[PDB]
Amino acid sequence: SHMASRILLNNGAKMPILGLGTWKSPPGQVTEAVKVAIDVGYRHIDCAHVYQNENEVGVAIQEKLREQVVKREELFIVSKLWCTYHEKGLVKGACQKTLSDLKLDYLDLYLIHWPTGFKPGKEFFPLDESGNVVPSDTNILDTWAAMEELVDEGLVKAIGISNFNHLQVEMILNKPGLKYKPAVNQIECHPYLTQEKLIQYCQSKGIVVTAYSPLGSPDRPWAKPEDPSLLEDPRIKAIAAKHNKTTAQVLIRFPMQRNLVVIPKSVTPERIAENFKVFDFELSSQDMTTLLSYNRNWRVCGLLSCTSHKDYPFHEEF
Ligand SMILES: NC(=O)c1ccc[n+]([C@@H]2O[C@H](COP(=O)([O-])OP(=O)(O)OC[C@H]3O[C@@H](n4cnc5c(N)ncnc54)[C@H](OP(=O)(O)O)[C@@H]3O)[C@@H](O)[C@H]2O)c1
Numbered sequence: 001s002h003m004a005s006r007i008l009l010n011n012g013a014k015m016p017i018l019g020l021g022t023w024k025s026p027p028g029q030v031t032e033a034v035k036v037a038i039d040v041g042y043r044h045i046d047c048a049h050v051y052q053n054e055n056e057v058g059v060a061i062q063e064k065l066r067e068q069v070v071k072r073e074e075l076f077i078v079s080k081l082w083c084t085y086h087e088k089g090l091v092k093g094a095c096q097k098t099l100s101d102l103k104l105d106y107l108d109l110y111l112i113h114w115p116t117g118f119k120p121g122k123e124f125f126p127l128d129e130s131g132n133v134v135p136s137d138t139n140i141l142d143t144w145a146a147m148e149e150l151v152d153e154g155l156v157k158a159i160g161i162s163n164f165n166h167l168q169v170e171m172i173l174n175k176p177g178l179k180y181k182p183a184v185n186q187i188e189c190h191p192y193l194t195q196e197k198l199i200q201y202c203q204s205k206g207i208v209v210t211a212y213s214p215l216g217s218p219d220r221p222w223a224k225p226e227d228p229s230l231l232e233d234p235r236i237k238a239i240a241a242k243h244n245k246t247t248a249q250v251l252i253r254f255p256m257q258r259n260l261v262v263i264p265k266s267v268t269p270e271r272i273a274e275n276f277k278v279f280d281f282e283l284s285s286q287d288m289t290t291l292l293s294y295n296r297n298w299r300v301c302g303l304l305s306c307t308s309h310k311d312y313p314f315h316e317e318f
Pocket residue numbers: 020021022023024046047113162163186187211212213214215216217218219231246248249263264265266267268271272274275300301
């Protein structure tokens with residue numbers, strides 16, 4: 001379908017363009033979800049410590065390795081450093097906890113989950129008595145240096161960023177003494193948040209973009225009935241019908257044809273399989289431009305409790 005399965009990263013490794021998301025996947029369902037995904041062809045799993053389900057994801061990965069359904073070198077496992085671990089002295093331990101839970105001896109890619117550092121401690125969103133999230137002082141260039149050390153210690157093959165705006169990406173690229181460029185910026189992207197400016201910037205610097213919430217995250221916990229709904233948009237349904245595919249399949253193919261990686265989440269076996277069957281059709285340029293035209297700057301993930309943080313990413317235009 002004029003579509004290779006992997007994209008070359010600036011660390012020299014190849015990354016599967018379609019992965020399985022795991023945010024909100026219940027711990028009692030995610031082991032089967034990941035097993036099914038690997039069985040039906042997925043080779044990339046997107047994880048995070050803050051999702052609280054890495055142990056269960058890891059059970060699935062380990063079983064499929066033990067069963068010899070896949071070899072470790074064929075898998076591309078991604079996780080993310082949570083905001084309460086931006087300190088120099090906490091990054092390695094946070095990575096190692098993720099490795100121990102996923103039952104891996106390296107990650108293919110480790111991302112700074114958000115540019116905002118928070119006070120370390122047990123709470124993922126530490127609050128002051130008035131409800132503000134308590135920041136860390138550690139600046140993100142120092143967090144990046146700590147990520148670089150993980151490459152040099154063999155814990156991770158690639159490092160990257162997530163939810164960074166273009167000025168924050170530029171800060172990393174302009175870092176004095178930069179040793180490794182970010183390989184990936186993982187950002188929200190779908191027809192209602194098309195991200196042209198940030199995607200162009202990242203791609204022009206050789207940074208691969210991964211699109212999260214490609215279906216508009218209908219299970220996001222703050223969903224309101226009045227919100228827009230990609231899967232129910234009749235205009236997108238019409239493009240899907242024309243191609244004899246589902247709306248979800250169109251929504252997944254869309255970022256693929258922008259040279260993005262995409263990570264739809266499901267715990268439903270039939271949908272996991274459906275979502276992978278996107279290498280057998282092509283959207284036209286006109287389809288692509290039409291889908292881009294639906295942009296409304298609508299965000300699933302605004303980190304809305306953190307808008308006063310000095311490194312909050314979404315005040316900038318892009
Ligand atoms: N870096 C970040 O800050 C960040 C933020 C958000 C997301 N992410 C990553 O991106 C992944 C994907 O984003 P997301 O989880 O927000 O949402 P999403 O992938 O846009 O949507 C997931 C929702 O769509 C449903 N669904 C999946 N396939 C479907 C299909 N074929 N037909 C109908 N409904 C379908 C799922 O239901 P069922 O599961 O019940 O089947 C679930 O409710 C996350 O899981 C996470 O790995 C990263």
